[PDB]
Each structure stands twice: as structure tokens, then as C-alpha cells.
DNA sequence: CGCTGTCTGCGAGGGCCAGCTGTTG
DNA sequence: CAACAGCTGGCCCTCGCAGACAGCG
């Protein structure tokens, strides 16, 4: 139902 | 870990530990969910036992936990092939355990515990002894350079500082073990003491610095007798981090806010809460320290409020991804030396020379389009040596 | 953790007549490798607790709720407890020659409540695994099939094993119980090396029961048999009262004195 | 002022704990910050009292913090609370009591209320107060005596010093209560402004205007709230319980046409009493009992038109009993300021959003238009429903080699255009256009540089609005985006940042900006912060984006902007890298594409 | 030949950043 | 001597106004 994008639903930070 | 020390130690020692029951419990009770039921099944056994069978006796399923039991405890040897039989010294002093042959307590381990952590720290109000400072200097987390001026503290003496007081206390004896026998004292005899504390001269010095840690107390000026803390056999948080980097933490201990102040800012203080801001100055100045971020929020992690218990993650993602970047934004250019390899008229050769850099584990970068590649000073006479051969 | 509880059935006419048959296996050595597998049982883990109970013609008394040999001080207490328990309980006892054949499910009885009781005490961070280690040694009684078969559910209904270790004879009706609630079950015929089985198949708990290679199920014949003769019956007939297994067609069963209707 | 070993302001010796402190959940320092804990169970009632006597500096969502100023003071005994009962909460709520200075201070700051009065009547300005002896106090002031005109007590001052003459009573602690008594003027008549009944106010926005009408008399001040929070609506139902001729000056040609349907739809005033005073047109001001304009057409300095002339002569000459001025931050600009004092108000109401600025002068606003009568919290409205929750981001986009080349060497201002047009933030702009296009949403764009919004708006091929751009025109744009759905994002300039009521706008995304103005970025989010229609409180309708060029000058202003939204508890997630990108078809893929537009940006110097 | 709409310069202003003096320890 | 205010210049953009030029009658 429309979920938000990877980039803003997890850190994308390496560490 | 505990197992991962007894694992470390020579086989004329461990025969030598296993020595009064309490001790082969002890190294009993850490056997990890199969080999003790194995420990069981061999014990009244006088006669060894094929390889195989031991290994038949798992089903297929979850058979890595076969063989990683048996071998650990081929490490801590108590059992030997035979061509599998336990140590008869194991076996009869094992068998002598299995039917052979308050509150002021834990206040007194976590304050005595705490001042030397104010020693740790540049702290005025804190316990003075000799040998303790010589210790902890000589443990590796500390460093005085001058007998008479006051110690500092290291770049592992402040990670050390943020560790977990478990972790903090483990890591501590783990280095006191492994330095008593440099200093002539014996590991067996306070490496048994430990485990039948879990239930000489060397020991009453020994017993002393326990006494000090605070995880043992005599209470009765020194007397035969002693009364071991909670801390010896082996908390809520007050701390609320905000989204736009200020740390509130409910202290009262000087300790903590020392502790705190080693990654922030101090702003305010209240008898209990304080009011610390995440500045990146500050951050970049404990990650120039020492100090490494994951400790950072692991440490604001662990001493997190109850409020922020429910909010799942507790510490604010853009705060713990915040103190990430401040980290590695200081790291960005990766100095590494080395001596670059160019001019390489032979082509063909290049590709060879790769080859036997890559072989003797020397070569860290190279470029094949532009025909060259670096190699660590260390290795740097190898490949000029083979060069010189042509 | 879990609850080990060692029903031992220490019926003194059955081992009595091995006293008078002077033979090599003895009571008090059974008493010493249920001693030495409770032992083990607590050596294994700090959290573990167990629990021994006992059985008579009579009633059934638990067994169980510095280091002067060396042994670990915890240890040296139960072994103590128990030692006095059981020499007061054989030594004490009246003559009764109408009743003579041993009681377990009574004993039992005893023993699924005690894990309830000990369960509603243990705090609800830690999740217990209770266990019973019932070791029949004599042969079962007759009329005690209804109220065995009861306690037998309820260990099924509150996830109580039930490792049967008869031994000098198979109790058709213990070797039912075992496969119910997922226990096991085992005859041995080595009475002197009772305790190197108990070791091997029955002191391992139920979460690495599993992760181990054990002897395998006992064929159990389920048998049923008219309420007439107690012989066995493939096809019964039975009603919607007494629920009463039957021998064959009557105009009305005898336990209902109902006015079954033909049809 | 102890301060301890790590830079700390010792205040140990200064307070004591209270032994009920669990309970009590604030804490007040000598330095007068006020630190209120949001997880307490009393923090419904000592956020109201404590908003009032002290502007908010940092509302994130575990604990709060205020400030207290002489101004922030004066707005409490103005709404009707006074320095005994300010104090005896105060302490009441303190955890650890309040200091005999800030004790004293409170006090100091609130026998200042009420000892004079600023009264306007038949177009004339008058000093009234009861007490004979502060005006006679006043009269000794040298500046106060200038600007004089060349029981109760009243002498006349010109118009054209009103400001010199607030600025100095505030100076001199007596402060001028611009206080309207509508109810009982009779002079001015009634207009037929009235509330629809299908018109109901939110409880933030009754409780501003119940603070603006505590008593019967209209009080002028600032009333602050969330953009998109509905100040439209508070403003008209100030007009509507004036009953007064009413003025509102909005930002721009945009503003006032959203101010004339915001009436329209939210009062029965009929459309011919409605008028605009724009360059554009005018809808006859010489006869509209309700007048909607801009800063800029009152404001302007030089000669005006003739059309424009005789329009502001009737302005000029005219009785105001509401001046309802939006965007109040822009007032204490040097020339914005004078309108006040050109147009004729008894009543000054304020509406803004963000009561900031990079300068001084937006305190001037307490004298200027009046105190800060509300300020409402936006989480508090974020999780009522009441405001659109924005996940907001900043998009860390790399420098190009080839740029930073010549960033790093350049110096003489160059540098914005440079990073402002980044290759890399290029794409990723594409990218986050596509992939929210495909999701249903209605996306923003921003540009400070109208090179960069040029540049953006024909690659792209998308809708583009700035100054050059006819009222008409621009106007047509926000229709289409509004309704037509083939218009699903648009490109705006600084024009656009404030007023622009888009309540579909579920994204935003800004590509440049002017410096770091905290004004400029809580403005822009204000945008897609409206409600939306099938909004869900805890589900994240809005999002916004910063695009950013990292290891560049922007990462200070990108820091410095961010400033005011973290303080109202926004957090800004970092987006090193977005996902999919690489599999996208996106602009300047090549290095030729992006030499070619380096040399471009040089070019425009 | 007149009138209205479009487009393009003049002049001014807002907002913010950066600078060479003025001032203080 | 070293260090910090401090109002204005500059730049970006924006706005209102005036003038000329083109479409329409
Ligand atoms: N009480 C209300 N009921 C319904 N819609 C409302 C209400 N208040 C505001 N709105 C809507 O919210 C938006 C407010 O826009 P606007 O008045 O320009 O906000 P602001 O001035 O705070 O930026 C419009 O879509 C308006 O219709
Ligand atoms: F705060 Be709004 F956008 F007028
Ligand atoms: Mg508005
Ligand atoms: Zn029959
Ligand atoms: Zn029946």
C-alpha cells in the first residue's frame, strides 16, 4: 500500500 | 570469555588447575549444552572408546553442534584419544564433586569498583595505592611516564572506560591473570580461587587485590574469612538522547557525568539530570581519543531512560547515523605505506611480478591498465631481490 | 531450566524378595543411582532443581523438596535428606495383606502437582521444562488403570514427560503413559548397570533429547477388551453413557440401565 | 554563573532539589532556561502556562526547553496571567524552585503592564493612562518629548513616530497596550462579516483567538503556528469577531488571491465587499469593507501609478479596527515596517510560521504588531492529524571531480552555481522525481537560483515558477498542479517558499537555497505540511529532501538551516546513497554531458 | 488612425554572507 | 599586541512602475 523507499524505511549508512 | 582463557593455556597448567573438585565443576559448568551430557556418559568409564562412536551419537540434524563441542573440549583436553578417555585426574577429581571423596554487599562492590574508575578519569576524589596505579598502568590501559605526576589514561584505558561494568570488570581480571604470572605469581592457584569464589602467600596478596576491585570483603579487618560481592562470582538508565543531539542525563554519580563528558558537551548541571549536547568537536575529539563510535551509542544504548524504551530504536536513528558519519568523516583518506612499482618497460613481466606479489601476500593495491602496484615496505626487499635476480 | 522428578517405586515386597533371593542388585544401590543421576542432574546447571519421590503399599512420601567429602555443598545436603528420608520410610511401615501391590499413580499424582505448584512460584522470566523420571520396578495394579490413566493427560495437557525406566518386568500400562506425553521408555535387563542408562538416554533434558541418537519406541498394543470377559476385542460396542467398551450386542447395558431403544 | 570542569554552568549552589521532585517536572536555572519533560503526566497543563511567559528554543519529543525573556514575560501578564500567579505555578511546577534572581526578574517584568495605554481614534494617536506620574516620567524621556505632536491623562502624538515612540516606552519598561476595544466602537460601522456555521475552528486555533480575546477587547499580537496549521482561518475569524473593516497584507499576488478564497470559503462575507489591491488588478478598494494587498504594493517607496496612487490615498485616509498582517517575520524589514504606520490599525494580529530570522529585529515584533500571543507545538499538531507528518532527509549527493576541481580553486562567489548545478545532485533529483511520480505523489521543487531552476525545470521538462513569471501564469500552474493530474510536480523560486496552500503536495524536494535562512527551509516544508486528505497520523504522508553536495559549503548551511525544524523535534535522516539509481536511465551518465554543463556554469559567471 | 495586451528595461527593496574598520583584554 | 563587535557593500533574487512594440478594431 504505497510503502516508503528503502533509503528512507533503513539506515543506509555503512556502519 | 572465560572458556575462551582456560582454551589459551598450556596442557602441564590445565592438569595442574583441575586439581580440588570445585574446579572441574567449574570447567563443567561452562560445557555448553552436549559435551556435558558426553562428560557424564565417560565418567565412571576406565576403558577407552572408539572416535566413532562418539560421533554417531548425533542425529544428522544439528550436527555442527557435534563437532564444535567435541572440539572445544579437545582443547581444554580433558579427554584424550588413547589410540577417548577423560584426564584420570578429571575423571577421579570430577567424580570427588559428584558425590566423592546482602544488599550491602553489592553497594560496597559498586562504589569501591567506581573510584577506581574516578582514578581512571582525571578525577581529584579518588583511591590512591601504589600498586594499584603500577596495575593498571601495566595492564595496558593506562600509562604515567612520570611516577611522580598523576597517570593519564590511554587510547584503550577511555574504551575500556565505556565498556559495560561486566565487560569492564572480565576484561580487567583477564589482564590481571594473564600479567600474575609475569609478576611471579601463580595462575593456577588465583585461576582455581575464582572459580570456587563462583560457589597462601600468593593468595593473600591476591585476595588484597580483590579486595580492592571491591569484588571480595573481609569486613571483619582482614580476617580468614571473606564475603565475595555479586561482581565477584563472575541496571535502569538515566540517560535521554533527543533527536537534535542533546544528551539528559539523570546522574548523581560524578563518575557517569565524567563519562558523558567524554563525548559532549556539559551545558547545565542538575542534582538529577545534566544537560549534554552531542557536538561534533566533541565527538570528533572522543573518536581522536580513542575512543570508536559504536561504543558511543553502545554506551548511550545500554544507559538509555526508560522513556525511551518503548521508541523502538531507543537512540533516535538520525543521532546514532549522525555519530557514525562524525566518525568516519575523520578517516576519510586511508594513509597506508608503501612503495609504488612504475616504468614497467616489461609488460608481459608486470603481469609475472603481479603474480609472485600476489603469492607472498605483499601486494596491497595494483593497476593493471596503468601497468603498476604497490607493496608494503615490509615485503619491499622480496620483490626487489626478485627483481635483482631477473 | 528444568525439574527432573525421580519416582522411584521402592516397593519393599518386590525389594525385599531380591534381599531374599540375595541376588546381586539391591534397593539401596537403586537409591545411590537415583542419588547419583540427581546429582548429576543439578551438577549439570546452577538453575536446574529435581525432586525424588517414592512408592508403598501404603503411601508415598518426596524423597526431596560444610563439604565434609569434598563434594560440592549443595549436593551434600539432598544426599543427606534423602539418605534418612528413605532408611525412615522402608524401616516404618504397617502390614497390610489385603493391599500388597505397589501404588504410582498416587505417587505421580503428587508429582504433576508439584511442578504446578513449582511452576506458578518460578518468576516469569525463566520457562521451566519439567520432567519425571518414573522408575517402575514392579509389576502394575489392576484397579489403579482409571486413575493412572487421568494423571497421564494431565502431564500431556501441562507438557510433562514421562521417562519410563521399568526394569524386571514391562508395565503394559507405564509403556502406554511414556508414549503419550512424548516420554520414553526403556526395560533394562542389566539391573547393575542401571545408572550408566540413566546417564545416557534419561538425564539428557527434552530440548537436546532431541539433538541425540536414543533407543527406539516400544511397539505399545493399545489393546481394548470387553467389560464381560477382559479379553481383547478389535470392534467394540459402547454407548453414548457409560462410554463402556462391550462384549457384544445386548438389549441394554448392564453399567446404564438405560432404555436403549432397538432399531 | 559557577561553571564546572567540562565548561558546565555550575548551578548546584544556586537551587535546591524539592523532595516531590518525581512529580514536579521542570527544572529552572538562574540563567532563566526552563526544561520541561514531555513524558511527564502533568505536561498538558505546564506546557500552556510555560509557552506563554516563555518562548520555546527546543521542543524535541522526550524533554523541552524554554527561555525566559523580558518580552516573553510581557506576553503573559498581557493574556491575563500576573506575577504572583506566574510565580506560584512557576514554582509549583519547579522540581528544584526558582532563584531569587529569576524570582525577582519574573517580577521585575510585570509591573510594567497597564501603566500606559496607546489609544487611536478619529485618525489621531493618543498616549492614555490612568496614573498622571508615568506619563509624566515618559514626558522627561528627551526622544519622547520629539515626537510629541507640534484621573486619565492623554496628550497627542503624530502618526509618522508611532515606532520611535513603542520602541522607546519598551526601553523605558512601559510598555503600550495597543489594546482595540471593538465591542465598544460604535464610531467605525459594523461590516457584515460573519463565521458559516460550516466553518468550525480547531482547539489550537479557538485557543490562539482565546488569548487574543481574553477579555472584551481585542488584543493585537503575533500569533504563531505551523504552516499549513489553517492561520487562514484563524485570520478570518479575527475579522469576524471585530466586525470592523478589516485589512490583511499578505506577501504576494499568490497570498492575497488564497487570502480572498480562504474568506470566501470560510465566511459568508459576500464577494463584492472582497477586493485586492495588486499590481495585477484591483477589485474596486475605493469601496470593500475587507481590503487583501502585499507588502510590496502598501510598502513601495517610489512615486505610485495613478491607479495605485488614488487607492492608497483612500488607504491613507481610513480607520482600520483589524490589520491582519501574514508573514509578520518580513515586518521588521526597513521599508515593510512603515506600512504599519502609512495604514491606519487599531488592532494588530499577526500570522506567521516561523518566528525567526538570520538578524536581530525579530524582536522588534513585540512593539512593532505586539507580544507573541500563542505558539502552538508542532508534534503536538503532528500527531493530532492537524499537520501532514513529513519524514524529512538530506539527500548527500557527491561533488563531481570535475566540479570540485574548480570549487575548491574558485572563490569569488562562483561557487554557488557550481554546486548548486552538481551533475550528482542532477540525478538524483531525476531519480526522486520518477520513482515518486510512479507512487501517486505530488511533488515540490525548490531552487534559490533561478539558473538552477532553468536548468532543472527544461531537463526535466517540468512546470517552472519564478519571478519573471505572470500572476496569471503562475497561477494557472498551481491549478493544474492542484487538479490536473499530468501536472504532478512543479518547479517554484523564492517566490513560492511562503503563503502557497498546496494541501496535495505529499513531497518536496529542494535543490538550492539562499544561505542558511532557518526561515527559508521551515517556510519551504511548510508547503507539503498541509493536511492531507486520507492522512494517516502515524504513517508518514509527506516527505521532504534536501538535496545536498557533499564535502562542500552546502553542508554548513545544510546544517544551519536545519536548525529550527530539529528544534521543533524533526529529524533529519541522512541518505548517503539512494537505492536504484543505478538502474535508472538518469541524466549526465556520461562524462561528455557533464563537461559540457561545467563549461556551461562557467560560462554564466 | 486609436485602444489593449505583452514584453522589456529603470528604479527600488528583502535576505543573507562576507568584509575592513572600531573597540576592548 | 591579540581578539572580538559591527554596520555596510555586495550579491542573489524579487517587486512595482514606466516605456515601447504588437495584436485587434
Ligand atoms: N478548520 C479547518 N477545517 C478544514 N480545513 C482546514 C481548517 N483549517 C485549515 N484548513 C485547510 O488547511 C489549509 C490551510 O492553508 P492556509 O490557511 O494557507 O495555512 P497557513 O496560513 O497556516 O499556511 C487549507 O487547505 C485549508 O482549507
Ligand atoms: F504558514 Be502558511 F504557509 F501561510
Ligand atoms: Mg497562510
Ligand atoms: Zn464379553
Ligand atoms: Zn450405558
Redesign the pocket.
Known amino acids: 500500500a504505497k510503502e516508503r523507499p528503502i533509503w528512507l524505511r533503513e539506515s543506509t549508512v555503512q556502519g | 570469555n572465560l572458556q575462551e582463557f582456560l582454551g589459551g593455556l598450556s596442557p602441564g597448567v590445565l592438569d595442574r588447575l583441575y586439581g580440588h573438585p570445585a574446579t572441574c565443576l567449574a570447567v563443567f559448568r561452562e560445557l555448553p549444552s552436549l559435551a556435558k551430557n558426553w562428560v557424564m556418559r565417560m565418567l565412571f568409564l576406565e576403558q577407552p572408546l572408539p572416535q566413532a562412536a562418539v560421533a554417531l551419537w548425533v542425529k544428522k540434524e544439528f550436527s555442527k553442534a557435534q563437532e564444535e563441542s567435541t572440539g572445544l573440549l579437545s582443547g581444554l583436553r580433558i579427554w584424550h584419544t588413547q589410540l577417548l578417555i577423560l584426564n584420570p585426574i578429571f575423571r577421579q577429581n570430577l567424580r570427588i564433586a559428584l558425590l566423592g571423596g546482602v544488599p550491602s554487599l553489592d553497594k560496597y562492590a559498586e562504589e569501591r569498583w567506581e573510584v577506581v574508575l574516578h582514578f581512571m578519569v582525571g578525577s581529584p576524589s579518588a583511591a590512591v595505592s601504589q600498586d594499584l596505579a603500577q596495575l593498571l598502568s601495566q595492564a595496558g590501559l593506562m600509562k604515567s611516564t612520570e611516577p611522580g605526576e598523576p597517570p593519564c589514561i590511554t587510547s584503550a584505558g577511555f574504551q575500556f572506560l565505556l565498556l559495560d561494568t561486566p565487560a569492564q570488570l572480565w576484561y580487567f581480571m583477564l589482564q590481571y591473570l594473564q600479567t600474575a604470572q609475569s609478576r611471579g605469581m601463580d595462575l593456577v592457584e588465583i585461576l582455581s580461587f575464582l572459580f570456587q569464589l563462583s560457589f597462601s602467600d600468593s593468595l593473600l596478596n591476591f585476595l588484597q587485590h580483590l579486595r580492592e576491585f571491591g569484588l571480595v570483603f573481609q569486613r571483619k579487618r582482614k580476617s580468614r574469612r571473606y564475603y565475595p560481592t555479586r561482581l565477584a562470582i563472575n541496571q535502569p538508565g538515566f540517560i535521554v538522547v533527543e533527536t537534535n543531539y542533546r544528551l539528559y542525563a539523570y546522574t548523581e554519580s560524578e563518575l557517569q557525568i565524567a563519562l558523558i563528558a567524554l563525548f559532549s558537551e556539559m551545558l547545565y548541571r542538575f542534582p538529577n539530570m545534566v544537560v549534554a549536547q552531542v557536538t561534533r568537536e566533541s565527538v570528533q575529539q572522543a573518536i581522536a581519543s580513542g575512543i570508536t563510535a559504536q561504543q558511543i551509542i553502545h554506551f548511550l544504548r545500554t544507559r538509555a531512560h526508560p522513556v525511551m524504551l518503548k521508541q523502538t530504536p531507543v537512540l533516535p536513528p538520525t543521532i546514532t547515523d549522525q555519530i557514525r558519519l562524525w566518525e568516519l568523516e575523520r578517516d576519510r583518506l586511508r594513509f597506508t605505506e608503501g612503495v609504488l612499482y612504475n616504468q614497467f618497460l616489461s609488460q608481459v613481466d608486470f603481469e609475472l611480478l603481479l603474480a609472485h606479489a600476489r603469492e607472498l601476500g605483499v601486494l596491497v593495491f595494483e593497476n593493471s591498465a596503468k601497468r603498476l602496484m604497490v607493496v608494503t615496505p615490509a615485503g619491499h626487499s622480496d620483490v626487489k631481490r626478485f627483481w635483482k635476480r631477473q | 531450566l528444568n525439574l527432573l522428578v525421580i519416582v522411584v517405586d521402592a516397593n519393599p515386597i518386590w525389594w525385599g524378595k531380591q534381599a531374599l533371593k540375595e541376588s546381586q542388585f539391591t534397593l539401596s544401590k537403586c537409591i545411590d543411582a537415583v542419588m547419583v543421576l540427581g546429582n548429576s542432574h543439578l551438577f549439570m546447571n546452577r538453575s536446574n532443581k529435581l525432586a525424588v519421590i517414592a512408592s508403598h503399599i501404603q503411601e508415598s512420601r518426596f524423597l526431596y523438596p560444610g563439604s565434609k567429602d569434598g563434594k560440592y555443598e549443595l549436593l551434600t545436603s539432598a544426599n543427606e535428606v534423602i539418605v534418612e528420608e528413605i532408611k525412615d520410610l522402608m524401616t516404618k511401615s504397617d502390614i497390610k495383606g489385603q493391599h500388597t501391590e505397589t501404588l504410582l499413580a498416587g505417587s505421580l499424582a503428587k508429582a504433576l502437582c508439584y511442578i504446578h505448584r513449582m511452576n506458578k512460584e518460578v518468576k516469569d522470566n525463566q520457562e521451566m521444562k519439567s520432567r519425571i523420571l518414573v522408575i517402575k520396578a514392579a509389576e502394575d495394579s489392576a484397579l489403579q488403570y482409571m486413575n493412572f490413566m487421568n494423571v497421564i493427560f494431565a502431564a500431556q495437557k501441562q507438557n510433562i514427560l514421562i521417562d519410563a525406566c521399568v526394569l524386571d518386568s514391562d508395565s503394559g500400562l507405564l509403556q502406554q503413559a511414556c508414549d503419550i506425553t512424548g516420554g520414553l521408555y526403556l526395560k533394562v535387563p542389566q539391573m547393575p548397570s542401571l545408572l550408566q542408562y540413566l546417564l545416557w538416554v534419561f538425564l539428557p533434558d527434552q530440548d537436546q533429547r532431541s539433538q541425540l541418537i536414543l533407543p527406539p519406541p516400544v511397539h505399545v498394543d493399545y489393546r481394548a477388551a470387553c467389560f464381560c470377559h477382559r479379553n481383547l476385542i478389535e470392534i467394540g460396542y459402547v454407548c453414548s453413557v457409560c462410554l463402556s467398551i462391550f462384549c457384544n450386542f445386548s438389549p441394554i447395558c448392564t453399567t446404564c440401565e438405560t432404555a436403549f431403544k432397538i432399531s | 554563573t559557577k561553571v564546572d570542569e567540562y565548561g558546565a554552568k555550575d548551578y548546584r549552589l544556586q537551587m535546591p532539589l524539592k523532595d516531590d521532585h518525581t512529580s514536579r517536572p521542570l527544572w529552572v536555572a538562574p540563567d532563566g532556561h526552563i526544561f520541561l519533560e514531555a513524558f511527564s503526566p502533568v505536561y498538558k497543563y505546564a506546557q500552556d502556562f510555560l509557552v506563554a511567559i516563555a518562548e520555546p528554543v527546543c521542543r524535541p519529543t522526550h524533554v523541552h526547553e524554554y527561555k525566559l525573556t523580558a518580552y516573553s514575560l510581557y506576553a503573559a501578564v498581557s493574556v491575563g496571567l500576573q506575577t504572583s500567579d506566574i510565580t506560584e505555578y512557576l514554582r509549583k511546577l519547579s522540581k528544584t524552585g526558582v532563584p531569587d534572581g529569576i524570582m525577582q526578574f519574573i517580577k521585575l517584568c510585570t509591573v510594567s503592564y497597564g501603566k500606559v495605554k496607546l489609544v487611536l481614534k478619529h485618525n489621531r494617536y493618543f498616549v492614555e493612562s490612568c496614573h498622571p506620574d508615568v506619563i509624566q516620567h515618559l514626558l522627561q524621556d528627551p526622544v519622547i518629548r520629539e515626537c510629541r505632536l507640534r484621573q486619565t491623562v492623554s496628550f497627542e502624538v503624530k502618526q509618522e513616530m508611532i515606532e520611535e515612540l513603542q520602541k522607546r516606552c519598551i526601553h523605558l519598561e512601559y510598555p503600550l497596550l495597543a489594546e482595540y476595544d471593538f465591542r465598544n466602537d460604535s464610531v467605525n460601522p459594523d461590516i457584515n462579516i460573519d463565521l458559516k456555521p460550516t466553518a468550525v475552528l480547531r482547539p489550537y486555533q479557538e485557543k490562539s483567538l482565546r488569548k487574543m480575546f481574553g477579555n472584551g477587547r481585542a488584543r493585537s499580537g503575533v500569533i504563531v503556528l505551523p504552516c499549513g496549521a489553517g492561520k487562514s482561518l484563524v485570520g478570518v475569524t479575527a475579522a469576524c469577531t471585530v466586525r470592523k473593516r478589516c485589512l490583511v497584507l499578505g506577501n ?2 499568490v497570498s492575497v488571491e488564497q487570502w480572498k478564497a480562504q474568506f470566501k470559503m470560510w465566511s459568508t462575507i459576500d464577494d463584492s465587499q472582497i477586493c485586492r489591491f ?2 495585477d488588478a484591483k477589485d474596486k478598494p475605493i469601496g470593500c469593507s475587507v481590503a487583501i494587498s ?1 507588502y ?2 502598501l ?11 488614488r487607492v492608497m490615498e483612500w488607504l491613507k485616509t481610513q480607520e482600520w479596527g483589524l490589520m491582519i498582517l501574514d508573514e509578520v ?2 515586518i ?5 515596517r512603515r506600512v504599519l504606520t502609512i495604514v491606519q490599525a487599531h488592532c494588530k494580529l499577526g500570522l506567521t510560521a516561523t518566528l525567526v ?3 536581530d529585529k525579530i524582536v522588534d515584533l513585540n512593539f512593532l504588531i505586539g507580544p507573541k500571543l500563542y505558539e502552538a507545538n508542532w508534534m503536538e499538531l503532528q500527531n493530532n492529524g492537524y499537520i501532514a507528518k513529513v519524514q524529512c532527509a538530506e539527500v548527500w549527493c557527491p561533488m563531481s571531480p570535475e566540479f570540485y576541481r574548480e570549487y575548491v580553486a574558485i572563490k569569488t ?1 562562483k561557487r ?1 552555481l557550481l554546486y548548486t548545478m552538481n551533475p550528482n545532485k542532477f540525478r538524483a533529483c531525476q531519480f526522486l522525481i520518477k520513482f515518486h511520480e510512479r507512487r501517486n505523489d505530488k511533488i515540490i521543487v525548490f531552487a ?4 538552477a531552476l532553468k536548468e532543472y525545470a527544461i531537463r526535466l521538462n517540468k512546470p517552472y515558477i ?3 513569471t ?1 500572476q ?1 501564469e503562475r497561477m494557472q500552474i498551481l491549478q493544474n498542479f492542484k487538479h490536473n493530474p499530468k501536472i504532478n510536480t512543479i518547479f517554484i ?3 513560492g517558499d511562503t503563503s502557497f496552500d498546496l494541501p496535495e503536495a505529499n513531497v518536496l524536494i529542494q535543490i538550492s537555497s ?7 527551509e521551515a517556510q519551504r516544508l511548510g508547503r507539503v505540511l498541509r493536511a492531507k486528505k486520507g492522512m494517516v497520523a502515524e504513517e508518514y504522508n509527506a516527505f521532504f529532501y534536501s538535496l545536498v553536495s557533499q564535502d562542500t ?1 552546502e553542508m554548513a ?1 545544510s546544517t ?1 538551516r536545519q536548525r529550527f525544524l530539529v528544534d521543533q523535534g524533526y529529524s533529519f535522516k541522512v541518505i548517503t546513497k539512494l537505492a536504484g539509481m543505478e538502474e535508472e536511465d538518469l541524466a549526465f551518465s556520461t562524462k561528455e554531458e557533464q563537461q559540457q554543463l561545467l563549461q556551461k556554469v562557467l560560462a554564466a ?1
Open positions: 504576494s499576488a495588486t499590481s502585499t510590496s504594493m510598502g513601495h517607496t517610489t512615486k505610485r501609478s495613478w491607479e495605485a496612487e517575520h518580513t521588521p524589514a526597513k521599508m515593510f530570522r538570520e538578524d562567489k554557488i534559490d537560483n533561478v539558473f519564478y519571478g519573471p505572470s496569471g523560486s523564492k517566490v539562499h544561505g542558511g535562512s532557518r526561515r527559508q559549503q548551511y544551519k559567471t
